[model samples]
Target: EVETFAFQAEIAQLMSLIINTFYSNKEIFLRELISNSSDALDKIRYESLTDPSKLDSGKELHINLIPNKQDRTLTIVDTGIGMTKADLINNLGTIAKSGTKAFMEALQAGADISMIGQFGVGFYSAYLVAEKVTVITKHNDDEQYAWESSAGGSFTVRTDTGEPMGRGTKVILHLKEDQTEYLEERRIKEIVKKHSQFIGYPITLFVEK
Candidate 1:
């Protein structure tokens, strides 16, 4: 079944904060996405410890970055733990916000400077640079699904029949007109090298020169 739901009050506020409040550091969007990719990869590796067969025998855990200048889209693909259809709703949609309420409270109260990473809303940071975002994920047990939204009140999730992800997540950011720098091969590489070089997984950016 397919449906669209409104973002919780806290989530709506959080979206505006990330986009407007953090506009000065909009470049951090790339860093946050890459950080989440690393976390997903780490989670799957940790899960695979006992179940030796979690991933195909020797599939590598890596992240690929592709910049489509023509389309003004930046795609981030990771060979890590993906999400189920429900997982998409829970992660991207704000079904519950008690914890988020606390975070927002602290944010408004001017608590410590950093909280985005700790609150685990790094995924929404994509709004800082993109007008629309699409996440395609395939978990081991759950079939592949697509989650998309404009960081507005609603989002939709549906089974994806285009191609099997094998096992991981792919995020496509439809760049905003003023955020075109994100779709540049050189810009992504520099951002990765500067903020995510310490990430465990290999980050390969597909560049066509």
Candidate 2:
């Protein structure tokens, strides 16, 4: 059974570090988010091979980027395992199981976590440049949900009213005015190749034309 979790004080502090001091380059968030997408793809594919049930469990895999310049929204969509509310809380609320503790320890020692995608802490990358983030996730294990946050120490979640994408998820980064560099097609492609090409899954990053 999956247990629920939230960020401890260490998590709150670590998030402060991630946003305020961890990275040397702000643009690296492009790489980080793509790297995380690649990880999710890897996870679902592997699980499907073992439990064919998981094949029907989630769904197909694709990654696309839609840059709505009019609204300043950089949207990333993926067909992978979506999380439940328990998952939203555990995955987004706090540093739960995957990547929280290692991140905290490394930060305490002045270690670099930029290159290493902390698993549990992975989705937190949205906080780097996103003034606000909205995640619409469709999970095979439970009802779909939407998770919204601004990294302001509080987040809100609600059930999805429309059809879940059969399975998988999408993240919309309402980019801050100064963070528009990520919306460039070449820039997103460059980050994908540099960090995620070697990842277990084939990543297709649709660019803005």
Candidate 3:
């Protein structure tokens, strides 16, 4: 069954801040996402320390960037600790309830996540370049789910059955017409190199010939 929810009361104000404050540097959207991927990868690795079963998928821990010019979309996938349905509702639907922040604080001094900006709101930066954003995620303990939003007043979540996914998350950005530069291999690579150069995971971008 598909469910829909409205953004938190402050989400509109927060989104306005992200758009207006970061408007001059719109490319940072990629940077913010890459940072998020790194955080997810770190969380999974940390969890697997006590429960090695989390790695049962045998998939390499990495991030993939796929740019589809034809569809005007950029998809970023991370093989990491994915979110459950509840997580999609709390962490994303409600701003400032960041799982990353809690995780980092739990680890205390040893937590070395290269965060780009505020954790909870960083995810919303997708709206900087995307008119719509879709997230498909599979957690080790939960069924796959898809979350879709247009930065409007509400967003939707549904059970995903189309493509099977390992324990990880995938974010697809339906780019606005003026933001198609993100669909270019060179441009994406350049942004990654500049902002996420020291990120822990391997960031791979798919190129079409």
Clashes of each: 0, 3, 0
Best by lDDT: 1
Per-model TM against the reference:
0.90, 0.81, 0.86
Prediction 3 TM-score vs. true: 0.86
The residue-level lDDT of candidate 3 at 168 comes to 92
**What are the per-residue Cα lDDT tens digits for candidate 3 across 159-193?**
99788887899999999899988998889989998
lDDT of model 1, residue 116: 66
Which portions of model 3 miss their true places by more than 4 Å? 17-22, 91-116
Q: What is the lDDT of candidate 3?
A: 0.80
lDDT of 2 by residue, 1-209 (tens): 22323445656665666678646466666667666677667778877887878767545676777877778888877777767777677545444533676767766687666644654566666777788888888777888787776664566677877665777778889998988878877887777777667665556655556
Clashing residue pairs found in predicted model 1: none
Quote the positional error of residue 182 for candidate 1 in Å: 1.1
Candidate 2 clashing pairs? 7-94, 98-120, 99-120
* Candidate 1 deviation (Cα RMSD): 2.3
Error of 1 at 95 (Å): 8.9
Measured by TM-score, the strongest candidate is 1
